[model samples]
Each structure stands twice: as C-alpha cells, then as structure tokens.
Target: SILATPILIPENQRPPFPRSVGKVIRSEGTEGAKFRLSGKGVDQDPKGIFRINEISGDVSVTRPLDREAIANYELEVEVTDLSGKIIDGPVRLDISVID
Candidate 1:
C-alpha cells in the first residue's frame, strides 16, 4: 500500500525524539522509481530539521525535536517524479512537539 496523494501529515503522534516521529512511504508502479524531496525551496526555517530518502520517499527528522525551543514545525516536502516534475506535492507536515 502506497500513499500516492498529496496531503498533510497526521496531527497526533509522539514525534521526533528517538527519531520515531514518523515516516512517509510510497511505492511506485514499477521499480527504479525516482523522487526528490525538499523544503521551502531554500532558506526555510529550522532548515536542517528533516531528511528525505530520495529513492524511497521516506522522510524523518535529523534529531529529536525540542518542544521548549519550538512548539511545532511546519515542513513542506515537495515530491517530484522521474522527470523532475512534481507528482505528489510540497505537502505540509505538522509536528507538534509535546512534553
């Protein structure tokens, strides 16, 4: 089962810490499916917060989130296809860091 549509991330989850926040997965119709993921194009706030697996579409946090530092984060993950075209989207992933 693959998540092929562009949509927002789930609001409820024990996130970031232990890097177990969440992961976005997708399965292409065939092998050798390519993808590219990014945030804000460039100069996005909390820039280094996330990392994406280009070939797998698996997104995760670089480290545990600091709730006291920031309550939440709005990340836009732009998914592109083989021809470098946006097939999915710059989907908004909301991470609510809780105590």
Candidate 2:
C-alpha cells in the first residue's frame, strides 16, 4: 500500500540525478510484487520525470521540478505479482513539489 499523505520533492535538486522520493512495498505478502507508475508527470504530460524501480519499489525523480509551473504530481502506483497478477494497489501517489 502507498502512503495516504503526499510525498514531498524539493523544487530545486542538486546535480547527481534520479532523486528518491520514497518506496512503496507491500506490508504483508510472501510472494514478490512489481511496482508501476502512470499519469501526469510520468507517462502522460510532463512525462519521464518520474520512474519506479520494478523490483525494489523505489520511486525517484529523473530531474528537478518547477513548482511554479507544476506544483504537484498526481500519479498512480500499482502493484502486481511476478505472474503479472494484480496484488494490491493502483493507489494515489501524490507528489508535492516544495521549496
């Protein structure tokens, strides 16, 4: 399951790249799960700014964000088993760009 509260990302991030926002792993499960992300600032408009590691469930920002232009990102985080079966969420992963 994902957090009900929003994940905060600094509007200005220095160098290096792929800044981690947070992770979303299952609280209870024996089998493995894969994480997927979609929607604004991801697969849609303002695309490729966000990415999730399929195996580790780590969420990251590809680059620095502009809070003035896009203050927030509304995306969906889904979980599925190795067999590609739906395991838990397609829950909201709200990301708020902060100063």
Candidate 3:
C-alpha cells in the first residue's frame, strides 16, 4: 500500500522490473485458516505500477517510479479473513512517489 511516507525503489534493484517495494499489511494467518487481501488501488495505477498479492497483501511495482510523471499515489484497501471480514483499513494510503 502507498503511504503518506514514500518508500524509495531501491537504487540497486537487481531483481529487475516489478521489484518488490512494500506490503499493504503485515499479514498473518491462523492454523488451518487462510487469508485474503485486496484493494481498489490494485487496479487504480494508471501506469500499471502497483500490484498486490490477493493472499499475502504484499504490494509491488512494475518499474522504478518516475517522480516527474507521478508525484504521488493513493490506495483504497479492503481485506477479509478466511471466515469473512472487512478491514477498516486505516483504508486510504496516500503515497508520495519519490525518486
């Protein structure tokens, strides 16, 4: 999830495009239980910059962020438990895209 605090795309990203940057949640699961993570921002990236793991809630970027093209980002998040639940979120993440 994009945050009010901008996380830098590591200058030394060697894993290549779609490098791992951050996660929307510190997700944890229970024994014999499964988890689901999702959000509106998952599809909001105009440049296709954001992606989230439906199960883990880890968020990644497709490429190094271009500060000139996008100065910030926002994500509306929702999640459910294996039994069905909705996270109040803190909900909206206001991300500052910095180079």
Candidate 4:
C-alpha cells in the first residue's frame, strides 16, 4: 500500500512568534531510522533549525523560526530498508504568519 501524504497545520494554528514550540506528527514507520525535516525561511546555512528524531518520527523546531519568511516549506523524508535501499518522498508544508 502507498503511504499517506503528510498534513500541514493552518497558519493560525502555528505559533504566533519565533521560539514558540510546535509539533509535527507523522505516520509511524520503521524504528531506528532517520527522517529529514526541511523548509524555506530557515537559516541559509546547511545546519539550520530543522530537526528530527532518528528513532522516532517526531520533528520540532530548535531555533526561533519565522513563518512569514518561510511561508511554505518542502520536506524530504527517507527510510532505509535492511538491504540499504531508500524509501523517500517530498512533502510540502504551508505556514501562516500573524502580526
């Protein structure tokens, strides 16, 4: 069966300001595997605020992130099989900003 697409929370539901806490819930998959969470408006550096739990699918923001600057983000997640094959996809997220 095919995996379901990731869901994005509305802008109003997101944190109003930077540094606020938010959560990304994803469908459960293989354990001890790593997934990636990426988006725009994040720091230009390669090591940005994006985060993910290798053992779990939980994702969070570590630094103060601006939603307005990165109104939309595209996430690429992948998991490897025992044989080392890759199962990955590109997911999109739309963020809303408030004054």
Candidate 5:
C-alpha cells in the first residue's frame, strides 16, 4: 500500500530561479521509523547531500543551495523497520527553476 507521494512545487508557486533554500514538508510516520531525503546539485561532488530525521520524518537542506548550479534534483524517502529491512519507496523528486 502506498503511504504517501512526493509533492512537487508547481511552476507558478515554485521558488525563484537559483533559489538559495530548499524545504520539504512531509507527514510523520510511526515512531522509531527512519526517514531520509536527499538531492544532487552541481556544487556538490560525487554524491549529493542526504538528510534524515528519526523522530519528525522531515528533511530539509542544511547547506546553502543554488538553482543555477544544479537546475534539477532527485529527492527520495526511505523507511526501515526495526529489523532494518527495506520498506518505503525511493521516491523521486523533480525540481525546476523559475524566472
């Protein structure tokens, strides 16, 4: 069963082009469940940044972001049971720059 799907920011309400901040809003799941969100950009090297919140399940950008540097990013969320087994999907997030 699908729990939730990633909501993409509409082009109209989308942040300004070359945005400096990235914010992701999500619902809280069962306690003790692990959730992670991540994205890739030009400034970043081989691997992009990953954010995880064990209690809130909310992930946000800890470092500064530049839209021009990386026009788009892929976001995902994963949940694991106490046994550490694969549970939730690797959700994909697509972001576009606004002028």
Candidate 6:
C-alpha cells in the first residue's frame, strides 16, 4: 500500500505536454517495476491528458486542462513487479485544476 496526495495545477499557466507533475514510489520491494495510472481523465473517458512513466513512476500532464470544463480528475495508480503481479497500489490520485 501507499499514500496519495492531491495535486493542484493552474489552468492559466499550464505546463508543457508531458510535464512531470508527481511521482509514485514503492515502499518495499520491486526495484525495477512498472507503474501505471488509470481512471477518469487519465485512461477512461476524456483521457489523453495524463500518463505515468513505467520505469520512473513519474506522472505527467499530456495536455493543458480547462478547469471550467472539468475542475478535478481522479486517477488510480498501480505498481507491478517483474512477473507482472501487483505488489504496491491502486491508490487514488487527486488532480485539481485551478483558475
């Protein structure tokens, strides 16, 4: 298991595409594992805006977001070992776009 924190992004000053926003870490084993982010505004409906680096666990913004359209986004983060078995989390990631 792991802990998750909410992230805030300013809509007017959004970063470049694929900008690193946050990171996920494995508390125990799985040194060389894969990380994934899924859920609304990530891999589900209205996606193509978020991605997680498999190796580094860096979560990035794929594009600018308009808070007026959607103020917040929720995502689930997962970590898998070399054999492709879940070892860490399916934790929540709260991404909020600010004005």
Candidate closest to the true structure, highest lDDT: 2
Please, what are the lDDT tens digits per residue for candidate 5 over residues 1-99? 213334333233333343323433334454555555544632245254335454455443334444456545656555666566756655664445333
lDDT of each: 0.52, 0.80, 0.51, 0.45, 0.46, 0.79
Local error of candidate 2 at residue 79 (angstroms): 0.6
User: Which ranges in model 5 have alpha carbons more than 4 Å from their true place?
Assistant: 1-28, 38-50, 95-99
Off by over 4 Å in 2: 1-5
Off by over 4 Å in 4: 1-28, 38-46, 82-84, 88-99
Minimum summed lDDT over a 10-residue window in model 1 is located at 4-13
**What TM-score goes with each of the models?**
0.58, 0.86, 0.59, 0.49, 0.54, 0.86
What tens digits encode model 2's per-residue C-alpha lDDT throughout 1-99?
544246898887886888888876656632577778899998998889989888777888998788999998889987788887877778888899998
What local lDDT does model 5 show for residue 87? 63
Q: For model 6, what is the error of residue 55's alpha carbon versus the real structure, in angstroms, after optimal superposition?
A: 1.8
Native-structure RMSD, model 4? 5.3
Clashing pairs in 5: none
RMSD values for the candidates in order, in angstroms, are 5.4, 1.9, 4.8, 5.3, 6.1, 1.8
Q: Name the candidate, 3 or 5, with the larger TM-score value.
A: 3
lDDT of 1 by residue, 44-70 (tens): 765666566666555555555555676
Question: lDDT tens digits, residues 22-97, model 4?
Answer: 4333455665444555545333343555555544545555444445655445555454544556554434433333
Tell me how many residue pairs clash in candidate 6: 0
Q: Report the lDDT tens digits of candidate 3 across residue range 20-77.
A: 5665553343333323323333554374566656555566777665567666676655
lDDT of 6: 0.79
How would the candidate models be sorted by lDDT, starting from the highest? Answer: 2, 6, 1, 3, 5, 4
